[PDB]
Amino acid sequence: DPDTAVTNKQSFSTDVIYQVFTDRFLDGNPSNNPTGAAYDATCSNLKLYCGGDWQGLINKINDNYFSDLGVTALWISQPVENIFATINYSGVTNTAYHGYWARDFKKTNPYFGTMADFQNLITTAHAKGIKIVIDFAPNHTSPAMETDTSFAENGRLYDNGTLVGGYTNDTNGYFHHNGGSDFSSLENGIYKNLYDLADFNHNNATIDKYFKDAIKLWLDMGVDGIRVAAVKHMPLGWQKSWMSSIYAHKPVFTFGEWFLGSAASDADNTDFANKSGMSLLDFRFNSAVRNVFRDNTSNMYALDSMINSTATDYNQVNDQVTFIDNHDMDRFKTSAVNNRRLEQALAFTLTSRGVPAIYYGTEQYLTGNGDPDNRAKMPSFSKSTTAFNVISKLAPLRKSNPAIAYGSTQQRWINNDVYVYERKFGKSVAVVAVNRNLSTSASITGLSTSLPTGSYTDVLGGVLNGNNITSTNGSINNFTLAAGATAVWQYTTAETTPTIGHVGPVMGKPGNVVTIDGRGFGSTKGTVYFGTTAVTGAAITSWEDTQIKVTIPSVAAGNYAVKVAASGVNSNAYNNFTILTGDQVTVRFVVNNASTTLGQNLYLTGNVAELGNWSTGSTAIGPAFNQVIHQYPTWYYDVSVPAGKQLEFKFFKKNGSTITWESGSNHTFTTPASGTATVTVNWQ
Ligand SMILES: [Ca+2]
Ligand SMILES: [Ca+2]
């Protein structure tokens, strides 16, 4: 199938995700609405259920609302059965409308519909090329007071009808009982209750196994992408393991939510995105967008920097999901913020790198500062807004022009209020000029692009005051960029040499199937490369110009670079493909008597890639924790590592470049062939 097809569950770079709070869109079925004080017909009260369900989405899918808007994927709230109880938080009754307070991940939220309904939604969506992405928060259950069982549903977790256990009298240790996260450390956040949310203990095998089984179900059903919530509050090791489990079943595009409140880098966030096997929601791109266009707190340079700084940190910057607003913040539009700016931030998002998402209601210029005001009911389904217009023109570009989909970004012109940047992938190009100034226009002179000689038209038709240019070998001729103007000029052509635009997913073990997207691969099956290893014949499950489905060859676990060769002509390399050793399990390492100096730390490293193949580098595990689950001088760390394999490992303290290893013999362990396990040792 072409890389653009809805069939491509491994890549959403060519897509436009429409993020929707199911309950707040369209109540297609009233029969499934909550009874009593959990329900609000007018939806005037947002802490309540308004009625929204899957039929309603089915509906807007059939009358082409989404197809006229050009969004190629729907991101809906978590489908799993939530707590039925109502919770008043000091005078105010709250409901699980958001879908965050789960109790059973193997049943569907009846207020959203049935299993048939869901399967009925998955069908209608693919029928029209709309992918379905869902939320899945494996971090916790519902709010739970341990002293008090009469509060909510005491976080009780079921398993397709059968109850596993609640927060109180949790003899087996499913949840964590460390109190709440005061948010001072990464550890404090991971291992402790988020607010009052019942924290799971993924080290517990039944919980480990449960989630593997649960996601497997939803994937088996048709989901194309999964959005993991609260990833900053669950161990990386456990998630990376959860991931390898998913990629072994039906590899789908997964991303997570690690909150950042600025365009500024955060190692932890970078690291995560890079070592977890999943991507993130580009909160730095979002901030950049907003200071510039919404808040007027930064200028175009700040935007250009964020563009570059992010490309350096993230390994696959194209997988980071972008946005202008979302359920975690004030609606972009406000009385002080004007439309052209909203439309400008859209145009920017829609044409920039990564996977873009649009919070439902944006096209309608919905406003609503804070929670749940940023979760207001869907106000209209008109296709007349200027916002609506801009999306329909700019979104299909992601499917038609691969410079948008997989291309690099480089600035041709810039100044405080003006920005002209260029996307390019192979021979294809796209140029976007932006002028945020609402009162003055700009005389752009000397602009150079890589647009072949021609007379170039504004893809937007001047809706956003775009003009027409003329290129003379890159050389664009002196032109005015009107006030609040924005124009998009592109250039597509056929690719002749193979050129990789994507590899999906980018981590797995030998035996898995990965998707290579690009252009020019040709039709006659060629050969793939994982480093120096040539994959050929029946290993290449599929082959065609824009996509190749290949099998991860049985090579040595490590970081590799994928190269493809269509007619002897090798393409470029998609660096950083992580090849595992095989199936993963999660092992909690505990070392005692590890006394560090001020500013010193402990890392893990062993004889397998998962542990860094004896390195003290970035590839080593750590720094280890020492506060919640175990305290200093006892350190601990959960790590994803090959199952049923004899491991050798040794701890080491680093404090400068100066490393200090454990003495004596390497510690050994034979990992479980499945699930999770603990392994305690003493600092030698
Ligand atoms: Ca309903
Ligand atoms: Ca947690």
Tell me if 606 sits within 8 A of 614, measured CB to CB.
yes
User: Which-ligand-closest: CA of 178?
Assistant: 2
- Report d(CA 620, CA 603) in Å as an integer: 6
3-state secondary structure of 146: coil
Pick from 251, 333, 253, 319: which is nearest to 281 by CA?
A: 319
Residues with CB under 5 A from ligand 1 (ion): 27, 29, 32-33, 51, 53
Domain 581-684 adopts which CATH fold? Immunoglobulin-like (2.60.40)
Tell me if 364 sits within 8 A of 346, measured CB to CB.
no
3-state secondary structure of 359: strand
Dist. CA 295 → ligand 2 center (Å): 34
- Named by the residue before each, gaps in the chain exceeding 2.5 A from C to N are none
Strands 253-256 and 279-280: parallel
User: Which-ligand-closest: CA of 30?
Assistant: 1
Whether cis (ω within 30° of 0) applies to the bond prior to 452 is: no
Beta-carbon-side half-sphere exposure of residue 660 (alpha carbons within 13 Å): 13
Dist. CA 660 → ligand 2 center (Å): 32
Tell me if 586 sits within 8 A of 208, measured CB to CB.
yes
Q: For residue 632, which amino acid is it?
A: Y
What are the beta bridge partners of residue 74?
Answer: 18, 132
| The 3-state secondary structure of 523-542, one letter per residue | CCCCEEEECCEEECHHHCCE
For 1-400, the fitting CATH number among 1.10.3720.10, 3.20.20.80, 1.10.10.10, 3.30.43.10 is 3.20.20.80
- Find the farthest-apart pair of alpha carbons in the chain and give their distance in angstroms, rounded: 76
DSSP state of 423: E
What are the beta bridge partners of residue 228?
Answer: 136, 256
Query: Which tokens sit at 163?
Result: 């109850």
Tell me if 471 sits within 8 A of 449, measured CB to CB.
yes
Tell me if 256 sits within 8 A of 279, measured CB to CB.
yes
Residues with CB under 5 A from ligand 2 (ion): 139, 199, 233
Query: Which tokens sit at 532?
Result: 């120096």
- Report d(CA 677, CA 640) in Å as an integer: 11
Q: Kindly compute the dihedral angle of the four CA atoms of residues 84, 18, 227, 44, in this order, to the nearest 10 degrees.
A: -30
Domain boundaries, the chain: 1-400, 401-494, 495-580, 581-684
Cβ neighbour number for residue 30 with a 10 Å cutoff: 10
Evaluated on CA atoms 199, 204, 207, 211, the torsion sign reads: positive
Dist. CA 30 → ligand 1 center (Å): 4
Pick from 548, 233, 216, 481: which is nearest to 344 by CA?
A: 481
Query: Which tokens sit at 366?
Result: 């919905």
Tell me if 278 sits within 8 A of 543, measured CB to CB.
no
Cβ neighbour number for residue 578 with a 10 Å cutoff: 21
Dist. CA 259 → ligand 2 center (Å): 15
Dist. CA 27 → ligand 1 center (Å): 5
Q: How far apart are the first and last CA of the chain?
A: 56
Q: For residue 28, which amino acid is it?
A: G
Same CATH fold, 581-684 and 495-580?
Answer: yes
Pick from 642, 650, 644: which is nearest to 668 by CA?
A: 650
Backbone phi and psi for residue 149, each to the nearest 5 degrees, phi listed first: -80, -20
- Report d(CA 333, CA 350) in Å as an integer: 17
Strands 667-670 and 646-654: antiparallel
- Report d(CA 66, CA 130) in Å as an integer: 8
Q: How far apart, in Å, are the Cα atoms of 295 and each of 290, 341, 347, 412?
A: 6, 10, 17, 25
Query: Which tokens sit at 592?
Result: 């005692």
Query: Which tokens sit at 519?
Result: 């252009």
DSSP state of 190: H
| Strand intervals (E) in 86-196 | 87-89, 92-94, 102-108, 131-136, 140-143, 157-159, 162-165
For 401-494, the fitting CATH number among 3.40.50.720, 1.20.140.10, 3.30.390.30, 2.60.40.1180 is 2.60.40.1180
Beta-carbon-side half-sphere exposure of residue 474 (alpha carbons within 13 Å): 8
DSSP state of 132: E
Our CA angle for 559, 315, 280, nearest 5°, is 120
3-state secondary structure of 90: coil
Dist. CA 213 → ligand 1 center (Å): 28
Dist. CA 87 → ligand 2 center (Å): 22
Element (H, E) at 650: strand 646-654
- Give the position of tokens 């709070």: 21
- Report d(CA 226, CA 132) in Å as an integer: 9
User: Which-ligand-closest: CA of 110?
Assistant: 1
User: Which-ligand-closest: CA of 193?
Assistant: 2
Element (H, E) at 608: none
- Report d(CA 495, CA 518) in Å as an integer: 9
User: Which-ligand-closest: CA of 139?
Assistant: 2
Pick from 633, 628, 630, 629: which is nearest to 600 by CA?
A: 633
Query: Which tokens sit at 376?
Result: 């207001």
Pick from 209, 213, 214, 170: which is nearest to 193 by CA?
A: 170
3-state secondary structure of 115: helix
Cβ neighbour number for residue 335 with a 10 Å cutoff: 7
Dist. CA 325 → ligand 1 center (Å): 26
DSSP state of 647: E
Residues whose CB falls within 8 Å of the CB of residue 273, separated by 6 or more in sequence, listed in order: 258, 279, 280, 314, 315, 320
What are the beta bridge partners of residue 637?
Answer: 589
For 495-580, the fitting CATH number among 3.90.550.10, 2.60.40.10, 1.10.10.10, 3.40.50.720 is 2.60.40.10
Pick from 601, 600, 614, 620: which is nearest to 648 by CA?
A: 614
What are the beta bridge partners of residue 81?
Answer: 104
Dist. CA 229 → ligand 2 center (Å): 11
Dist. CA 192 → ligand 2 center (Å): 6
This PDB structure is determined at a resolution in Å of 3.0
Query: Which tokens sit at 200?
Result: 């799971």
Evaluated on CA atoms 476, 477, 481, 486, the torsion sign reads: negative
Pick from 572, 571, 553: which is nearest to 512 by CA?
A: 553
Categorise residue 195: left if φ over 0, alpha if ψ from -120 to 50, beta otherwise: left
User: Which-ligand-closest: CA of 55?
Assistant: 1
- Report d(CA 314, CA 255) in Å as an integer: 13
3-state secondary structure of 298: coil
3-state secondary structure of 585: strand
Element (H, E) at 301: helix 300-313
Query: Which tokens sit at 304?
Result: 């250009």
